[PDB]
């Protein structure tokens, strides 16, 4: 099983530089190009560079030359990618992929990707979210399913983590998209129950804020 | 570089229904060694983008037949003989015949449903937050379709237009519906001076607004 991890998601300061990495595992890290792709604000995607783990030879998309440096760690089957000067234009998710293509073959082997690392070049400082419960008055959509849900407001910067009984309640949970506003921001999520469900057992919203630390459950009460 | 144009930006298919996208190039993407090297990604939502096609019309192993791909030159096609579920998302085609490579903007590919009704739960700011000096409703507007849908907030009856944070989730892979959250948020002192609340929606579904309230009092 050929899988490729990338690196945490990265707050920069803007002007300084960051390291990220794609430890790879499950194949001959040294005979195939690990190519760098940037994706920013959804469709969009932008080719960095490749190298080859084997000889250490790069490639560069003109653009990238002087942003993007890149390396790999034979003894460990890890690629790393360092972006210098971060600007806003580096605000983006960064991905690595071992493409595939052959050169020998003139065809194709399966393409792996990382998960992608979100970096985020900002001055602003960090801030933990408030976690509050949203329980119906209103929101009871009366009897037969009931639905509650959880307001994370005030923090920066992304991501935050937010589960439902700590996974246990998966179906039925819409989990909205932060929206930024004031240099802080704001995110929801709805769990949807049967009557039979609530208040009878409890519904616990999870969240977690790496960047600050902070894990908080809020237990919805009526 | 080359310039890869990807039409239609979207296209909403009934599943069970044929889908094809076009990518245009500004260069041929015919290589000096006489292959054309053409491909296209899919990338589902949260999840990274991978690869269906290579060399214009070659599956990648472990890719449905249903997907098909064509073209030559400048021109090529991706085609969908029968859309599933499964096959939402955004496409994109990557051209590698002249460096550096370049990919086209994206066609996002959206299941075409019957029509969903938004199930409207409000929200009131809870003790928490209240304690805090703040305060903010919230209205959760889930599962319809389509997608285009108007909420606006009215206290006591005046439609109010600052302190709201609207957010909406991709389409869902197990209904095709879409939901939305919409936050009001106001310091605890002027929500303490109002009494009605109210979260209305516009929606394809019905003639008259979608209203949910909740009038705020003492007891
Ligand atoms: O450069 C030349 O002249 C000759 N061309 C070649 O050798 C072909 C190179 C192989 C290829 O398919 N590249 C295109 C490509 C690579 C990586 C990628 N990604 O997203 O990771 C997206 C697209
Ligand atoms: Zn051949
Ligand atoms: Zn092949
Ligand atoms: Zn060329
Ligand atoms: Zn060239
Ligand atoms: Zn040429
Ligand atoms: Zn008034
Ligand atoms: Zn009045
Ligand atoms: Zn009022």
């Known amino acids: 099983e050929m899988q490729l991890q990338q690196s945490g998601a990265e707050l920069l300061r803007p002007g300084t530089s960051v390291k990220l990495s794609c430890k790879t595992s499950?194949?001959?890290?040294?005979?195939?190009?690990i190519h760098w792709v940037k994706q920013r604000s959804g469709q969009g995607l932008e080719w960095i560079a490749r190298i080859y783990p084997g000889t250490g030879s790069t490639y560069y998309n003109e653009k990238f030359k002087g942003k993007a440096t890149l390396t790999a760690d034979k003894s460990s089957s890890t690629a790393y990618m360092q972006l210098s000067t971060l600007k806003s234009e580096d605000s983006a998710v960064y991905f690595c992929?071992?493409?595939?293509?052959?050169?020998?073959?003139?065809?194709?082997?399966?393409?792996?990707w990382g998960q992608g690392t979100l970096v985020t070049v900002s001055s602003a400082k960090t801030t933990a979210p408030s976690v509050y419960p949203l329980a119906p008055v209103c929101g009871d959509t009366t009897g037969s399913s009931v639905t509650l849900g959880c307001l994370v407001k005030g923090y920066f910067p992304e991501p935050v983590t937010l589960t439902w009984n700590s996974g246990s309640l998966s179906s039925g949970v819409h989990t909205f998209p932060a929206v930024l506003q004031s240099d802080l921001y704001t995110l929801s999520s709805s769990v949807t129950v049967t009557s039979s469900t609530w208040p009878s057992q409890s519904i616990t919203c999870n969240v977690a804020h790496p960047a600050s630390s902070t894990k908080v459950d809020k237990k919805i009460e009526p | 570089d080359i310039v890869m144009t990807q039409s239609p930006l979207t296209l909403s298919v009934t599943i069970g229904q044929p889908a094809s996208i076009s990518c245009k190039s500004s260069?041929?993407?015919?290589?000096?060694?006489?292959?054309?090297?053409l491909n296209w990604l899919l990338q589902r939502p949260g999840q990274s983008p991978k690869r269906l096609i290579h060399?214009?019309?070659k599956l990648d192993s472990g890719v449905p037949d249903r997907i098909t791909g064509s073209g030559s030159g400048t021109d090529f096609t991706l085609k969908i003989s029968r859309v599933e579920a499964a096959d939402l998302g955004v496409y994109y085609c990557?051209?590698?015949?002249?460096?550096?490579?370049?990919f086209g903007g994206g066609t996002k590919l959206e299941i075409l449903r019957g029509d969903a009704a938004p199930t409207v739960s409000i929200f009131p700011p809870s003790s928490e937050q209240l304690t805090s000096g703040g305060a903010s409703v919230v209205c959760f507007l889930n599962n319809f379709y389509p997608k285009d849908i108007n909420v606006k907030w009215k206290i006591d009856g005046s439609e109010r237009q600052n302190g709201v944070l609207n957010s909406w989730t991709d389409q869902d892979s197990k209904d095709s519906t879409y939901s939305m959250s919409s936050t009001l948020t106001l310091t605890k002192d002027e929500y303490e001076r109002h009494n009605s609340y109210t979260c209305e929606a516009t929606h394809k579904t019905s003639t008259s607004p979608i209203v949910k309230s909740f009038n705020r009092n003492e007891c």
């Open positions: 990557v051209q590698g015949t002249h460096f550096p490579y370049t």
């Open positions: 499950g194949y001959i890290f040294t005979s195939y190009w």
């Open positions: 260069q041929s993407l015919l290589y000096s060694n006489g292959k054309t090297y």
């Open positions: 992929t071992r493409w595939g293509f052959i050169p020998v073959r003139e065809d194709y082997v399966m393409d792996y």
């Open positions: 060399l214009v019309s």
